[PDB]
Amino acid sequence: DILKASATQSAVAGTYQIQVNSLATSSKIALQAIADPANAKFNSGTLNISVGDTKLPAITVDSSNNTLAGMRDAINQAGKEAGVSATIITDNSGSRLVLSSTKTGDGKDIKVEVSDDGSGGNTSLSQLAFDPATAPKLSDGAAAGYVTKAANGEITVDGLKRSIASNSVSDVIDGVSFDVKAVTEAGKPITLTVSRDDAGVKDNVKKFVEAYNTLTKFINEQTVVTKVG
Amino acid sequence: DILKASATQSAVAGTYQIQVNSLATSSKIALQAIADPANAKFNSGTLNISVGDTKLPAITVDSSNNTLAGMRDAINQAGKEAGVSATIITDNSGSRLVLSSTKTGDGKDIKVEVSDDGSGGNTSLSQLAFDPATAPKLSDGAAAGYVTKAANGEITVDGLKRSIASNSVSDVIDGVSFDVKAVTEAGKPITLTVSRDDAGVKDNVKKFVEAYNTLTKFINEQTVVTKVG
Amino acid sequence: DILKASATQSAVAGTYQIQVNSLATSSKIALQAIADPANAKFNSGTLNISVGDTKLPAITVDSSNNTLAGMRDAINQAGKEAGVSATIITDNSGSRLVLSSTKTGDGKDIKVEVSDDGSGGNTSLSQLAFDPATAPKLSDGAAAGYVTKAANGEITVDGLKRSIASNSVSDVIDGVSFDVKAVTEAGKPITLTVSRDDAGVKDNVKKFVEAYNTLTKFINEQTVVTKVG
Amino acid sequence: DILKASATQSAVAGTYQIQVNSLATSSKIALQAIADPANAKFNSGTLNISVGDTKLPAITVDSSNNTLAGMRDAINQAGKEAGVSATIITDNSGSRLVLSSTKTGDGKDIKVEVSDDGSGGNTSLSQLAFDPATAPKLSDGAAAGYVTKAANGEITVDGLKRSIASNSVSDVIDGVSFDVKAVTEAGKPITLTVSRDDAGVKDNVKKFVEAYNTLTKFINEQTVVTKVG
Amino acid sequence: DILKASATQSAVAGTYQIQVNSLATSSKIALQAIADPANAKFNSGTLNISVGDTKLPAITVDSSNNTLAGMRDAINQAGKEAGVSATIITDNSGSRLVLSSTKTGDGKDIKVEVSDDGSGGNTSLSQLAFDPATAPKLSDGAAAGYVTKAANGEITVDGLKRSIASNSVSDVIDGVSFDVKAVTEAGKPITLTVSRDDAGVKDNVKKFVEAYNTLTKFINEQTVVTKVG
Ligand code: NA
Ligand code: NA
Ligand code: NA
Ligand code: NA
Ligand code: NA
Ligand code: NA
Ligand code: NA
Ligand code: NA
Ligand code: NA
């Protein structure tokens, strides 16, 4: 329904009390704001962006891309594989790059390491650096910060805790898959009913209801048909 | 349709021009009219009634049944086997016994043989005799006569004549049965078309497309079902 | 319509006055009637059945098939190739074999040649012979005869006669096929009109007005969609 | 209606009794039938086809087009201008070229002139010649003949005859055009009524009663609109 | 109905047997056909057109109007008063002027008098003259002739004949007007019934039963109305 939708493979019948304590989240960060973005040019250098283990192709910054829209274009094309996208948000501090990842789980935060040549433009390339270990939650101001931290969610099944790296999990209960969509209220768990029993093999009874009777009409009674003309 | 209704076992395709020249008929006769039937009682004796091959139980006429209605009741139960029934018809000549048979075909005429003791009542028992070899077609008057002659019918199939002993005939054309219901007009023959496979076998084949497809959901997709609360 | 249904490839515009004088027919014959078919068994020998060019497999008559129904079963499977089928018809003369062909045209008559060993049963095998060159049209009696003669049909197009070997003909008029279904009345010819472009090409052109216009919304107006909550 | 559909520019009122004695026709001819068209190839030469005034481009017959279908394709594109089309008709005499024109009127007959090199194939090119002055109406046989003669039609208006070169005529009655579609029965003339003003000008006048009245509300009553909240 | 539609002022009751033997007609003539009307220009002169009593303005033919269409335009505006209109009809003889009048009755024939200067163009002006006393009924050819003769119609009322100068007549029967629309069949007269009072005066009397009764509520019962809140 509104908290969890589930499905089954080949499992067993049963009932389960389930809580959702948190959802798995992905990473979304905001870099430092650039004053006067219409005339700002980044020094030449290299951008190394990673999300946990996974690394993006190193982005080389030159005069073909040392603008905000230039990095936006670069980042969006350097991250199509890993699911890292980018856009621009213009606030009272200036304009800034906003990067999002589609990867949920602990440790999948977006990191930006910067090699700055110290020359190439009017503003530093180093101010695009982002370290998930030190970065604060984003608040108003030109300073950088994360919007969401990548993290695991948590559910409980009949009292047993399960940290989840995605909101689509399988075999927490063997043969059962469900998509966790919202947190349950404190102490108010969902009852999950797995019925191995549908007496709807009476549907399969419709086979020999059809298979017999359908093959009594067009065969063995209407195989040869007559009428005047 | 209105002249002939047909049926099939398993035969072959083909077309046939059919004429119906006559129908098979059964026997129906009327015995002598009895003057003053309201006070008439028959002499003692025996009635032997037959229709062709078949003979009816010998009927003994005594003082428990020597009336017209008495003979009617006897014959009705002396003839349940062969399909001989009886009734009384009251005309300007009196009342008389009217006997019917359900056997169609040549020679299946109803015959009545009478041995009369010559005493037992006021009317002769002998005047209930009926010989189909001599009896005329019934006309007005006290005299006896047949109403219908038992006879074979006749059809032609593509020019070939078939005498039929019943209006329900089979295997005149191999594997085909039809009930002849009426005569065709002179020179206006019926076309009879025997069709084997149309939509064959694809009409009944649409079953096992479903019976198959139906065993995708309620089996192997609804074998185990989930629900939340 | 009811006399002729027509079709087109790609041809030219034009109008044609058409008469149908006759239809193409296939062969259908009836062999000699066999007296007392219920106890009749055929002498040993061979049946060679042909329809024009095409010859059927030589049929060997032995003690496994030397009955009428035995010949019926053989022919039905000895003739699946050429479209020769067989049945039995029971008339006042007895039972006889009735053979049909599906090949329309002149000379496609069914022929039966018989070599009779002169022994093997109670009836001659030779009386199943049929020579279309000598055989009369079937009439009542035990004698053999044809029911329909295989023959070409005839049509006229604007006065020009075309003999047709089938009632499904093509390219009598270039690019036009029609299935002739019935004869036209004497002096009442059908008008046949071949129309190339009406609403051309503007009927199907209304598609690419939409396919174009349809690719305004869901593409380039619904490429990116917004929503609030 | 079914005989004549009419139209008007701006004319005068009046009534007219109209007969249609004949329609304007176009030319349609059939050339000689070619025996064994499946292996027939034409001698070298030239085809000059004309319909009255109009002449078609001279057609050169060579080894790229010296077949019946080859001439069909040429004529179809050698005649797009004048409305001359062509097809092939296969009768008991063989296959032949059938040519049609769309120009109605007297003298607009299709003519075919042939210069034959006398060599190039197996059939003469000269037998495709057609002279409308000598050609008979087409009948069965290999010989050539016309199917329809190009001719003017004829109508009468209040007794006065008008020869028409097309079935779409104009200003026979000043300001009136009608498309003649069928012949009137002998002595059963059509009444044609030309009506100028009915509901005139008051049918369309009901507009400017509204267009006026409509400019009372949404203008000068809804020019400035008020609302509360 | 379909033959006669009638109306009343205030008359008396009665029944009448009515025949319609003929309708009143107006004049419609056709002048001489002009050969080569496309280059024809009329000599100088004057046209005086009259219909019975009424005379039209004298038409002066000059170099601004000495064509057929020029005369058409003049007459159309030289005749708006009397109901004389004109058009051109193009037949096998050429083009000609066709003039119509709307005045029904005996002697209201259209007459054309011509004074020809004998010079001014290529065709005589005198050939546009028309004398109803000598003119034949129009037939095919360049010659002039009338299309319809102006004439009175005729009806009979209970045997009494009335010549009518228009198909809209009044007070033939006092207080009764009817528009005669068609002829009655020979010996099949129409019955005409003039009914004074049916439901009289009680149909309209049902008004002042209400107008009275209606002035019970909204007046003298709803004069003063009460309500609570
Ligand atoms: Na900040
Ligand atoms: Na009788
Ligand atoms: Na009798
Ligand atoms: Na025969
Ligand atoms: Na026979
Ligand atoms: Na000819
Ligand atoms: Na010919
Ligand atoms: Na005349
Ligand atoms: Na004339």
Strand content of chain A: 35-45%
**Count of strand segments of chain A:** 16
Class by helix and strand content of chain A?
mainly beta
Straight-line distance between termini of chain A:
62 Å
**Can you summarize the main beta sheet of chain A?**
4 strands, antiparallel
As laid out across the biggest beta sheet of chain A, the strand order is: 12-11-2-15
Number of helices of chain A: 2
How would you spell out the order of helices and strands of chain A?
EEEEEEHEEEEEEEEEHE
Morphology call of chain A: elongated
Small-molecule binders here are: sodium ion
Instruction: Specify the oligomeric state.
Output: part of a larger assembly
**C-alpha-based Rg of chain A, rounded:** 29 Å
Estimate percent helicity of chain A: 10-25%
Biggest interface and its residues per chain?
A: A-B, 42 and 43 residues
Family (chains A, B, C, D, E): Belongs to the FliD family.
Subunit structure (chains A, B, C, D, E): Homopentamer.
Protein name (chains A, B, C, D, E): B-type flagellar hook-associated protein 2
Organism (chains A, B, C, D, E): Pseudomonas aeruginosa (strain ATCC 15692 / DSM 22644 / CIP 104116 / JCM 14847 / LMG 12228 / 1C / PRS 101 / PAO1)
What does this structure look like?
The structure is cut from a larger assembly and holds five copies of chain A (229 residues). With 229 residues, the first copy, chain A, is mainly beta. Chain A is built from two helices and 16 strands. In chain A, strands 12-11-2-15 form a four-stranded antiparallel sheet, with no helix packed on it. In chain A, a hairpin with a 2-residue loop joins strand 4 and strand 5. Chain A is elongated and about 95 Å long. At the B-C interface, strand 12 of B face helix 1 and strand 7 of C. Strand 16 of chain A pairs antiparallel with strand 15 of chain B, so a sheet runs across the interface. Chains A, B, C, D, E: It comes from Pseudomonas aeruginosa (strain ATCC 15692 / DSM 22644 / CIP 104116 / JCM 14847 / LMG 12228 / 1C / PRS 101 / PAO1). Chains A, B, C, D, E: Homopentamer. Chains A, B, C, D, E: Keywords: Bacterial flagellum, Coiled coil, Secreted. Chains A, B, C, D, E: Belongs to the FliD family. Chains A, B, C, D, E: It is found in: Secreted; Bacterial flagellum.
